Ligand binder design. Structure first.
Ligand SMILES: [Ca+2]
Ligand SMILES: [Ca+2]
Ligand SMILES: [Ca+2]
Length: 340
Protein backbone atom coordinates (compact mmCIF):
# COMPACT_ATOMS: atom_id res chain seq x y z
CA UNK A 1 0.00 0.00 0.00
CA UNK A 2 1.17 3.59 -0.62
CA UNK A 3 2.21 5.86 2.25
CA UNK A 4 -0.16 8.71 1.42
CA UNK A 5 -1.86 10.36 4.40
CA UNK A 6 -5.44 9.91 3.16
CA UNK A 7 -5.08 6.76 1.02
CA UNK A 8 -7.23 4.80 3.51
CA UNK A 9 -10.19 7.09 2.67
CA UNK A 10 -9.95 6.14 -0.99
CA UNK A 11 -12.18 3.04 -0.60
CA UNK A 12 -12.78 3.29 -4.33
CA UNK A 13 -9.23 2.03 -5.03
CA UNK A 14 -9.13 -1.03 -2.79
CA UNK A 15 -12.40 -1.96 -1.06
CA UNK A 16 -15.21 -4.42 -2.09
CA UNK A 17 -16.79 -2.28 -4.83
CA UNK A 18 -13.54 -0.40 -5.63
CA UNK A 19 -11.39 -0.90 -8.73
CA UNK A 20 -8.66 -3.11 -7.23
CA UNK A 21 -5.89 -0.66 -8.22
CA UNK A 22 -3.90 -1.85 -5.16
CA UNK A 23 -3.69 -5.39 -6.57
CA UNK A 24 -2.09 -4.05 -9.76
CA UNK A 25 0.40 -1.85 -7.89
CA UNK A 26 1.43 -5.12 -6.13
CA UNK A 27 2.19 -6.61 -9.57
CA UNK A 28 4.52 -3.64 -10.21
CA UNK A 29 2.32 -1.79 -12.72
CA UNK A 30 1.43 1.85 -12.14
CA UNK A 31 0.88 3.23 -15.67
CA UNK A 32 4.65 3.82 -16.18
CA UNK A 33 5.44 5.92 -19.29
CA UNK A 34 1.72 6.16 -20.26
CA UNK A 35 0.21 9.57 -20.95
CA UNK A 36 -3.42 10.31 -20.08
CA UNK A 37 -5.03 13.54 -21.33
CA UNK A 38 -7.71 15.28 -19.21
CA UNK A 39 -10.09 17.50 -21.18
CA UNK A 40 -11.61 19.53 -18.41
CA UNK A 41 -11.40 22.79 -16.38
CA UNK A 42 -7.60 22.84 -16.40
CA UNK A 43 -5.12 22.13 -13.62
CA UNK A 44 -4.08 23.49 -10.22
CA UNK A 45 -0.45 23.90 -9.15
CA UNK A 46 -1.16 21.45 -6.36
CA UNK A 47 1.70 19.85 -4.45
CA UNK A 48 0.03 16.44 -4.80
CA UNK A 49 -0.33 16.87 -8.62
CA UNK A 50 2.69 18.82 -9.93
CA UNK A 51 5.19 15.98 -10.33
CA UNK A 52 2.74 13.91 -12.43
CA UNK A 53 1.40 16.75 -14.55
CA UNK A 54 3.00 17.61 -17.89
CA UNK A 55 2.42 20.99 -19.51
CA UNK A 56 -0.86 20.92 -21.44
CA UNK A 57 -2.71 23.57 -23.42
CA UNK A 58 -5.64 25.96 -22.91
CA UNK A 59 -8.23 25.58 -25.69
CA UNK A 60 -10.77 28.04 -24.29
CA UNK A 61 -11.41 30.57 -27.06
CA UNK A 62 -13.63 33.10 -25.21
CA UNK A 63 -11.96 35.19 -22.48
CA UNK A 64 -15.33 35.56 -20.70
CA UNK A 65 -15.15 31.78 -20.11
CA UNK A 66 -11.38 31.38 -19.63
CA UNK A 67 -11.04 34.22 -17.09
CA UNK A 68 -7.36 34.56 -18.05
CA UNK A 69 -7.61 37.60 -20.37
CA UNK A 70 -7.15 35.91 -23.74
CA UNK A 71 -8.15 33.04 -26.04
CA UNK A 72 -6.19 29.87 -26.63
CA UNK A 73 -2.85 29.89 -24.80
CA UNK A 74 -0.09 27.62 -23.52
CA UNK A 75 -1.13 27.71 -19.84
CA UNK A 76 -3.98 25.36 -18.86
CA UNK A 77 -4.15 26.70 -15.29
CA UNK A 78 -7.67 26.40 -13.86
CA UNK A 79 -8.42 30.06 -13.08
CA UNK A 80 -11.54 28.93 -11.17
CA UNK A 81 -15.01 28.66 -12.71
CA UNK A 82 -16.89 30.39 -9.85
CA UNK A 83 -19.76 32.75 -10.67
CA UNK A 84 -22.55 34.78 -9.06
CA UNK A 85 -25.72 36.67 -10.01
CA UNK A 86 -26.73 33.91 -12.46
CA UNK A 87 -23.72 34.64 -14.69
CA UNK A 88 -24.30 31.18 -16.28
CA UNK A 89 -28.03 31.68 -16.89
CA UNK A 90 -31.26 30.46 -15.37
CA UNK A 91 -32.24 33.56 -13.31
CA UNK A 92 -34.12 33.44 -10.90
CA UNK A 93 -33.68 29.70 -10.21
CA UNK A 94 -32.24 29.57 -6.64
CA UNK A 95 -29.99 26.61 -7.56
CA UNK A 96 -28.35 28.50 -10.43
CA UNK A 97 -27.62 31.81 -8.75
CA UNK A 98 -23.99 31.15 -7.84
CA UNK A 99 -21.32 28.50 -7.61
CA UNK A 100 -17.96 28.10 -5.94
CA UNK A 101 -15.02 27.15 -8.14
CA UNK A 102 -15.22 23.45 -8.95
CA UNK A 103 -11.50 22.68 -9.44
CA UNK A 104 -13.17 19.82 -11.38
CA UNK A 105 -10.19 19.11 -13.71
CA UNK A 106 -7.84 18.72 -10.72
CA UNK A 107 -10.15 16.34 -8.84
CA UNK A 108 -10.38 14.30 -12.05
CA UNK A 109 -6.61 14.50 -12.71
CA UNK A 110 -5.84 13.34 -9.13
CA UNK A 111 -7.93 10.20 -9.57
CA UNK A 112 -5.85 9.28 -12.56
CA UNK A 113 -2.39 10.19 -11.25
CA UNK A 114 -2.15 12.09 -7.95
CA UNK A 115 1.45 11.90 -6.79
CA UNK A 116 1.64 8.73 -4.70
CA UNK A 117 4.06 7.50 -2.02
CA UNK A 118 5.01 11.14 -1.28
CA UNK A 119 3.44 11.08 2.24
CA UNK A 120 0.98 13.93 1.67
CA UNK A 121 -2.60 13.83 0.44
CA UNK A 122 -3.92 11.05 -1.70
CA UNK A 123 -2.99 8.38 -4.27
CA UNK A 124 -3.75 8.05 -7.99
CA UNK A 125 -4.99 4.96 -9.86
CA UNK A 126 -2.13 5.21 -12.40
CA UNK A 127 0.44 7.09 -10.32
CA UNK A 128 3.30 6.13 -12.68
CA UNK A 129 1.47 7.78 -15.60
CA UNK A 130 1.60 11.46 -16.53
CA UNK A 131 -1.40 13.70 -17.10
CA UNK A 132 -1.70 16.29 -19.87
CA UNK A 133 -4.31 18.91 -18.90
CA UNK A 134 -6.35 20.09 -21.88
CA UNK A 135 -8.29 23.08 -20.57
CA UNK A 136 -11.57 23.48 -22.44
CA UNK A 137 -13.97 24.39 -19.64
CA UNK A 138 -14.21 27.59 -17.62
CA UNK A 139 -16.95 29.81 -16.26
CA UNK A 140 -20.26 28.32 -17.56
CA UNK A 141 -18.58 25.27 -19.14
CA UNK A 142 -17.05 25.28 -22.61
CA UNK A 143 -17.59 25.41 -26.36
CA UNK A 144 -18.17 22.09 -28.14
CA UNK A 145 -15.57 23.26 -30.73
CA UNK A 146 -12.94 23.92 -28.02
CA UNK A 147 -13.59 20.48 -26.46
CA UNK A 148 -13.35 18.75 -29.86
CA UNK A 149 -10.20 20.60 -30.94
CA UNK A 150 -8.66 19.86 -27.53
CA UNK A 151 -9.46 16.14 -27.60
CA UNK A 152 -7.96 15.92 -31.09
CA UNK A 153 -4.76 17.68 -30.02
CA UNK A 154 -4.71 15.41 -26.94
CA UNK A 155 -4.46 12.38 -29.26
CA UNK A 156 -1.67 13.82 -31.40
CA UNK A 157 -3.60 15.87 -33.94
CA UNK A 158 -2.18 19.17 -35.14
CA UNK A 159 -4.27 22.32 -34.62
CA UNK A 160 -3.18 25.39 -36.60
CA UNK A 161 -1.59 28.04 -34.35
CA UNK A 162 -0.86 25.54 -31.55
CA UNK A 163 2.40 23.58 -31.05
CA UNK A 164 2.51 19.87 -31.94
CA UNK A 165 1.70 17.81 -28.87
CA UNK A 166 5.01 16.25 -27.74
CA UNK A 167 3.08 13.92 -25.42
CA UNK A 168 0.06 12.57 -27.27
CA UNK A 169 -2.13 10.46 -25.02
CA UNK A 170 -3.20 6.81 -25.32
CA UNK A 171 -6.20 7.53 -23.05
CA UNK A 172 -8.30 10.71 -23.21
CA UNK A 173 -10.51 11.42 -20.22
CA UNK A 174 -13.65 13.48 -20.83
CA UNK A 175 -15.58 14.07 -17.60
CA UNK A 176 -18.01 16.38 -19.34
CA UNK A 177 -21.05 16.48 -21.59
CA UNK A 178 -24.56 17.84 -22.07
CA UNK A 179 -28.01 16.94 -23.44
CA UNK A 180 -28.35 16.12 -27.13
CA UNK A 181 -26.93 13.97 -29.87
CA UNK A 182 -23.21 13.83 -30.72
CA UNK A 183 -22.49 16.67 -33.20
CA UNK A 184 -20.89 15.98 -36.59
CA UNK A 185 -17.82 17.95 -35.42
CA UNK A 186 -17.51 16.08 -32.09
CA UNK A 187 -17.98 12.69 -33.78
CA UNK A 188 -15.44 13.55 -36.45
CA UNK A 189 -12.76 14.55 -33.92
CA UNK A 190 -13.48 11.52 -31.74
CA UNK A 191 -13.07 9.29 -34.80
CA UNK A 192 -9.80 11.02 -35.68
CA UNK A 193 -8.49 10.60 -32.13
CA UNK A 194 -9.53 6.94 -32.23
CA UNK A 195 -7.69 6.42 -35.53
CA UNK A 196 -4.55 7.90 -33.88
CA UNK A 197 -4.89 5.10 -31.31
CA UNK A 198 -6.51 6.93 -28.37
CA UNK A 199 -9.29 5.48 -26.21
CA UNK A 200 -11.79 8.27 -25.46
CA UNK A 201 -13.25 7.61 -22.02
CA UNK A 202 -16.35 9.66 -21.19
CA UNK A 203 -18.88 10.31 -18.41
CA UNK A 204 -22.40 8.91 -18.83
CA UNK A 205 -23.87 12.09 -17.27
CA UNK A 206 -25.79 12.89 -14.10
CA UNK A 207 -29.51 13.48 -14.71
CA UNK A 208 -30.83 10.00 -13.87
CA UNK A 209 -31.73 9.67 -17.57
CA UNK A 210 -30.83 7.54 -20.54
CA UNK A 211 -27.21 8.35 -21.39
CA UNK A 212 -28.08 7.90 -25.11
CA UNK A 213 -29.87 11.28 -24.84
CA UNK A 214 -26.52 12.95 -24.11
CA UNK A 215 -23.07 13.45 -25.59
CA UNK A 216 -20.37 12.23 -25.66
CA UNK A 217 -22.09 8.92 -24.72
CA UNK A 218 -24.19 8.98 -27.91
CA UNK A 219 -20.97 9.22 -29.99
CA UNK A 220 -19.43 6.16 -31.63
CA UNK A 221 -15.93 5.22 -30.49
CA UNK A 222 -16.19 6.25 -26.84
CA UNK A 223 -16.22 4.25 -23.63
CA UNK A 224 -19.05 5.61 -21.47
CA UNK A 225 -18.80 5.26 -17.71
CA UNK A 226 -21.70 5.10 -15.24
CA UNK A 227 -21.38 5.72 -11.51
CA UNK A 228 -21.65 3.26 -8.66
CA UNK A 229 -21.55 3.75 -4.87
CA UNK A 230 -19.50 2.20 -2.07
CA UNK A 231 -22.42 -0.28 -1.74
CA UNK A 232 -22.01 -1.48 -5.36
CA UNK A 233 -25.29 -0.16 -6.74
CA UNK A 234 -26.11 2.66 -9.18
CA UNK A 235 -25.53 6.17 -7.80
CA UNK A 236 -28.96 7.89 -7.80
CA UNK A 237 -27.94 10.54 -10.38
CA UNK A 238 -26.12 8.24 -12.81
CA UNK A 239 -27.29 8.11 -16.40
CA UNK A 240 -27.90 4.62 -17.71
CA UNK A 241 -28.85 2.37 -20.61
CA UNK A 242 -27.38 0.31 -23.42
CA UNK A 243 -24.73 2.90 -24.35
CA UNK A 244 -23.18 2.86 -20.88
CA UNK A 245 -20.22 0.49 -21.29
CA UNK A 246 -19.34 -0.14 -17.64
CA UNK A 247 -19.37 1.57 -14.25
CA UNK A 248 -16.87 2.79 -11.66
CA UNK A 249 -16.97 4.39 -8.18
CA UNK A 250 -18.66 7.78 -8.57
CA UNK A 251 -19.88 8.81 -5.11
CA UNK A 252 -17.66 9.95 -2.19
CA UNK A 253 -14.55 10.00 -4.36
CA UNK A 254 -11.65 11.67 -2.52
CA UNK A 255 -9.19 13.66 -4.67
CA UNK A 256 -7.17 16.85 -5.16
CA UNK A 257 -8.76 20.33 -5.23
CA UNK A 258 -8.16 23.83 -3.77
CA UNK A 259 -9.88 25.25 -0.70
CA UNK A 260 -10.58 28.55 -2.52
CA UNK A 261 -14.20 29.40 -3.27
CA UNK A 262 -13.14 31.69 -6.13
CA UNK A 263 -9.40 32.00 -6.80
CA UNK A 264 -6.88 29.35 -5.55
CA UNK A 265 -6.06 29.73 -1.82
CA UNK A 266 -4.43 26.45 -0.70
CA UNK A 267 -4.01 22.81 -1.74
CA UNK A 268 -6.89 20.72 -0.45
CA UNK A 269 -8.70 17.39 -0.82
CA UNK A 270 -12.44 16.85 -1.14
CA UNK A 271 -15.05 14.21 -1.75
CA UNK A 272 -17.09 14.58 -4.94
CA UNK A 273 -19.86 12.62 -6.56
CA UNK A 274 -20.57 12.28 -10.28
CA UNK A 275 -19.98 10.22 -13.38
CA UNK A 276 -17.14 12.78 -13.76
CA UNK A 277 -15.45 10.94 -10.84
CA UNK A 278 -16.15 7.44 -12.18
CA UNK A 279 -14.63 8.28 -15.56
CA UNK A 280 -11.04 8.88 -14.34
CA UNK A 281 -11.11 5.55 -12.48
CA UNK A 282 -11.59 3.93 -15.89
CA UNK A 283 -8.99 6.19 -17.54
CA UNK A 284 -6.53 5.27 -14.76
CA UNK A 285 -7.24 1.55 -15.12
CA UNK A 286 -6.78 1.91 -18.89
CA UNK A 287 -3.30 3.40 -18.24
CA UNK A 288 -2.46 0.54 -15.85
CA UNK A 289 -3.51 -1.92 -18.58
CA UNK A 290 -1.32 -0.19 -21.20
CA UNK A 291 1.73 -0.27 -18.88
CA UNK A 292 1.17 -4.05 -18.45
CA UNK A 293 0.66 -4.58 -22.20
CA UNK A 294 3.82 -2.51 -22.89
CA UNK A 295 5.83 -4.91 -20.68
CA UNK A 296 4.88 -7.91 -22.85
CA UNK A 297 5.29 -5.99 -26.12
CA UNK A 298 1.53 -6.00 -26.82
CA UNK A 299 -0.32 -3.31 -28.77
CA UNK A 300 -3.96 -2.54 -27.94
CA UNK A 301 -6.18 -0.60 -30.33
CA UNK A 302 -8.85 1.57 -28.64
CA UNK A 303 -11.48 -1.09 -29.44
CA UNK A 304 -9.28 -3.83 -27.94
CA UNK A 305 -8.52 -1.80 -24.80
CA UNK A 306 -12.23 -1.06 -24.37
CA UNK A 307 -13.02 -4.76 -24.75
CA UNK A 308 -10.38 -5.64 -22.11
CA UNK A 309 -11.96 -3.14 -19.69
CA UNK A 310 -15.60 -4.11 -20.34
CA UNK A 311 -15.15 -7.91 -20.34
CA UNK A 312 -13.12 -8.02 -17.06
CA UNK A 313 -15.44 -6.01 -14.78
CA UNK A 314 -16.51 -7.15 -11.32
CA UNK A 315 -20.18 -7.71 -10.42
CA UNK A 316 -22.68 -5.24 -9.03
CA UNK A 317 -24.18 -5.70 -5.57
CA UNK A 318 -27.29 -7.69 -6.45
CA UNK A 319 -29.80 -6.34 -8.95
CA UNK A 320 -29.50 -2.82 -10.29
CA UNK A 321 -32.55 -0.79 -11.45
CA UNK A 322 -31.09 0.12 -14.86
CA UNK A 323 -28.60 -1.17 -17.44
CA UNK A 324 -25.19 0.22 -16.37
CA UNK A 325 -22.68 -1.61 -18.52
CA UNK A 326 -21.04 -4.90 -17.70
CA UNK A 327 -20.01 -4.26 -14.09
CA UNK A 328 -17.47 -2.25 -12.09
CA UNK A 329 -14.05 -1.65 -13.73
CA UNK A 330 -11.54 -4.12 -12.25
CA UNK A 331 -7.86 -3.29 -12.71
CA UNK A 332 -6.66 -6.65 -11.35
CA UNK A 333 -8.72 -8.68 -13.85
CA UNK A 334 -7.98 -6.27 -16.72
CA UNK A 335 -4.18 -6.37 -16.16
CA UNK A 336 -4.18 -10.15 -15.59
CA UNK A 337 -5.97 -10.48 -18.96
CA UNK A 338 -3.24 -8.70 -20.98
CA UNK A 339 -0.36 -10.35 -19.09
CA UNK A 340 -1.75 -13.68 -20.31
CA1 LIG B 1 -6.63 32.14 -22.51
CA1 LIG C 1 -4.74 29.94 -19.86
CA1 LIG D 1 0.07 11.89 -2.40
Amino acid sequence: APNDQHYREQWHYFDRYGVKADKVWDMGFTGQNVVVAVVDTGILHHRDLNANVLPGYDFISNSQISLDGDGRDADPFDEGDWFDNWACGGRPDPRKERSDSSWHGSHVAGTIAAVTNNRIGVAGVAYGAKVVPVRALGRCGGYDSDISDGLYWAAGGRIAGIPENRNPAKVINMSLGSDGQCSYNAQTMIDRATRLGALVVVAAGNENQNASNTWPTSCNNVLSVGATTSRGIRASFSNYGVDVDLAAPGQDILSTVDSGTRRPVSDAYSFMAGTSMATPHVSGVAALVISAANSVNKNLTPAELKDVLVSTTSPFNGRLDRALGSGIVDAEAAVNSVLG
